[PDB]
Amino acid sequence: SGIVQQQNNLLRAIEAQQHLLQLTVWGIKQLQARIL
């Protein structure tokens, strides 16, 4: 059970990290549009 619970925790962390990554990509694209 503990192991399975921990897997859930890690998966959730990976998902949140993915949202953050998507946000940084947006930002980079915005900056590139103005900068180039």
Binding site: G2, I3, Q5, Q6, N9, L10, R12, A13, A16, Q17, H19, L20, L23, W26, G27, Q30
Partner: protein, 34 residues
């Protein structure tokens, strides 16, 4: 960009919490291995 800031803040806080939860669980699991 304001919405961007809001979202960054949101997910950063969430990840921090998840990481802490995971750390606690890691300790518990190691302890149970004994």
């Amino acid at each position: 960009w304001m919405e961007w800031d809001r979202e960054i803040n949101k997910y950063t806080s969430l990840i921090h919490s998840l990481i802490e939860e995971s750390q606690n669980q890691q300790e518990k699991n190691e302890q149970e291995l004994l």
